[PDB]
């Protein structure tokens, strides 16, 4: 949780009732800019797997880049020529679904003109999967490390990361695009996860035009899809709906139960899908092999939702979405030129606009 200074000044306080009122309608699809990267296809003989026939969980070392706009080599170079507003998916969906979080988060703003450009800050945990996040008890660390929070969040990650990579067909040639990713030379790029960029652009009234990063996991036989795990540590401990037990006949009561304590964490995927123009949402339903151990997993159900309508299933909004967006780019545009940092306040359902000194970082 970042440290409020005393040299910070509070520019704007926005509680999430107000926020959950806003709308921009009508915004259209993301308009491809660039599209960059090479992307590997879905093994569908994951399509079989369930509580009968349980996957372990495999560790695939491959390469995640979580790069901030401003480190960004492609929306620096689009920025001379195109856009007013910058950012990455991952970014956006933490602005657009802040009313669902619960955690603290924030994230810089720097303001040139009519420039905006929306950032992380270097070496914090911003890219973390929460877990329990929206229980109405979610995990305390009382205990050993094995179910703290942050322990917690790190197994999910870790979960993702190798469930994304696990599910790929290894030997079919990938689908590519003219361009290759840009985070890393062509002469090392077998390294890097299998990952698809397209740097999209929205216009978003008020002569608001946004240009953020966006991306998939996978392609599927062509269809574009986001990957990802949902996960059960301890059934009993959290209180929840035991997988191995319901999955086979209660697969929505399971899902449901996500739902209701993970509720940032599933609609921020969802965005990041709807975002990039996914076709499908593919889930991983990732259990520990024992409940006493965290680093060993087996994957139980495997799901497909196209994200739209997942959207309306989990009563995410798009439109409320770009309306909250829309509101922070608004206040921004209206300060002086400097810095920025929009948080959410980790006691209070509310998020902050700070005016903060421009070296503060
Ligand atoms: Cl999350
Ligand atoms: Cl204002």
Same mark, same amino acid.
């Given at each position: 949780?970042?440290?409020?200074?005393?040299?910070?000044?509070?520019?704007?306080?926005?509680?999430?009732?107000?926020?959950?009122?806003?709308?921009?309608?009508?915004?259209?699809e993301?308009?491809?800019?660039?599209?960059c990267?090479?992307?590997?296809?879905? @093994?569908?003989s994951?399509? %079989?797997?369930?509580? /009968?026939? #349980?996957?372990?969980?495999?560790?695939? !070392?491959? +390469?995640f880049? *979580?790069?901030?706009?401003? @480190?960004?080599?492609?929306? %620096?170079?689009?920025? /001379?020529? #195109?856009?007013?507003?910058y950012?990455? !998916?991952? +970014?956006?969906? *933490?602005?657009?679904?802040?009313?669902?979080?619960?955690?603290?988060?924030?994230?810089?703003?720097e303001?040139?003109?009519?420039?905006?450009?929306f950032?992380?800050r270097?070496?914090?945990?911003?890219?973390?999967?929460?877990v329990?996040?929206?229980?109405?008890?979610?995990?305390?660390?009382?205990?050993?490390?094995?179910?703290?929070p942050?322990?917690?969040?790190?197994?999910?990650?870790f979960?993702?990361?190798?469930?994304?990579?696990?599910?790929?067909?290894?030997?079919?040639?990938?689908?590519?695009?003219?361009?290759?990713?840009?985070?890393?030379?062509?002469?090392?790029?077998?390294?890097?996860?299998?990952?698809?960029?397209?740097?999209?652009?929205?216009?978003?009234?008020?002569?608001?035009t946004?240009?953020?990063?966006?991306?998939?996991?996978?392609?599927?036989?062509?269809?574009?899809?986001?990957?990802?795990?949902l996960?059960?540590?301890?059934?009993?401990?959290?209180?929840?709906?035991?997988?191995?037990?319901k999955?086979?006949?209660?697969?929505?009561?399971?899902?449901?139960?996500?739902?209701?304590?993970?509720?940032?964490?599933?609609?921020?995927?969802?965005?990041?899908?709807?975002?990039?123009?996914?076709?499908?949402?593919?889930?991983?339903?990732?259990?520990?092999?024992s409940?006493?151990?965290?680093?060993?997993?087996?994957?139980?159900?495997?799901?497909?939702?196209?994200?739209?309508?997942?959207?309306?299933?989990?009563?995410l909004?798009?439109?409320?979405?770009?309306?909250?967006?829309?509101?922070?780019?608004?206040?921004?545009?209206?300060?002086?030129?400097?810095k920025?940092?929009?948080?959410?306040?980790?006691?209070k359902?509310?998020?902050?606009?700070?005016?903060?000194?421009?070296?503060?970082?």
């Amino acid at each position: 949780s970042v440290t409020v200074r005393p040299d910070w000044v509070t520019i704007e306080e926005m509680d999430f009732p107000r926020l959950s009122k806003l709308t921009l309608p009508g915004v259209k699809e993301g308009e491809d800019v660039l599209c960059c990267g090479a992307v590997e296809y879905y @093994d569908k003989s994951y399509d %079989r797997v369930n509580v /009968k026939n #349980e996957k372990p969980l495999q560790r695939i !070392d491959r +390469i995640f880049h *979580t790069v901030t706009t401003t @480190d960004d080599p492609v929306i %620096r170079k689009l920025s /001379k020529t #195109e856009g007013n507003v910058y950012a990455t !998916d991952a +970014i956006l969906a *933490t602005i657009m679904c802040c009313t669902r979080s619960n955690y603290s988060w924030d994230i810089v703003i720097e303001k040139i003109g009519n420039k905006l450009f929306f950032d992380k800050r270097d070496n914090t945990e911003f890219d973390l999967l929460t877990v329990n996040e929206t229980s109405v008890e979610p995990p305390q660390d009382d205990g050993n490390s094995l179910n703290s929070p942050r322990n917690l969040a790190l197994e999910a990650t870790f979960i993702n990361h190798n469930f994304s990579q696990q599910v790929l067909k290894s030997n079919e040639p990938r689908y590519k695009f003219d361009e290759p990713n840009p985070f890393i030379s062509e002469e090392e790029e077998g390294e890097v996860a299998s990952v698809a960029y397209r740097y999209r652009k929205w216009d978003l009234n008020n002569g608001i035009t946004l240009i953020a990063r966006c991306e998939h996991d996978a392609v599927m036989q062509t269809q574009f899809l986001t990957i990802k795990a949902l996960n059960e540590w301890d059934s009993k401990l959290a209180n929840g709906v035991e997988w191995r037990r319901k999955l086979d006949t209660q697969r929505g009561a399971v899902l449901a139960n996500e739902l209701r304590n993970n509720a940032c964490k599933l609609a921020k995927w969802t965005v990041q899908a709807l975002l990039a123009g996914s076709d499908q949402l593919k889930f991983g339903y990732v259990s520990r092999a024992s409940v006493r151990d965290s680093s060993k997993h087996v994957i139980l159900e495997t799901q497909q939702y196209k994200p739209n309508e997942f959207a309306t299933q989990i009563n995410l909004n798009m439109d409320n979405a770009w309306g909250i967006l829309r509101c922070i780019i608004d206040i921004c545009m209206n300060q002086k030129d400097g810095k920025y940092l929009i948080m959410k306040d980790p006691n209070k359902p509310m998020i902050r606009l700070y005016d903060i000194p421009d070296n503060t970082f």
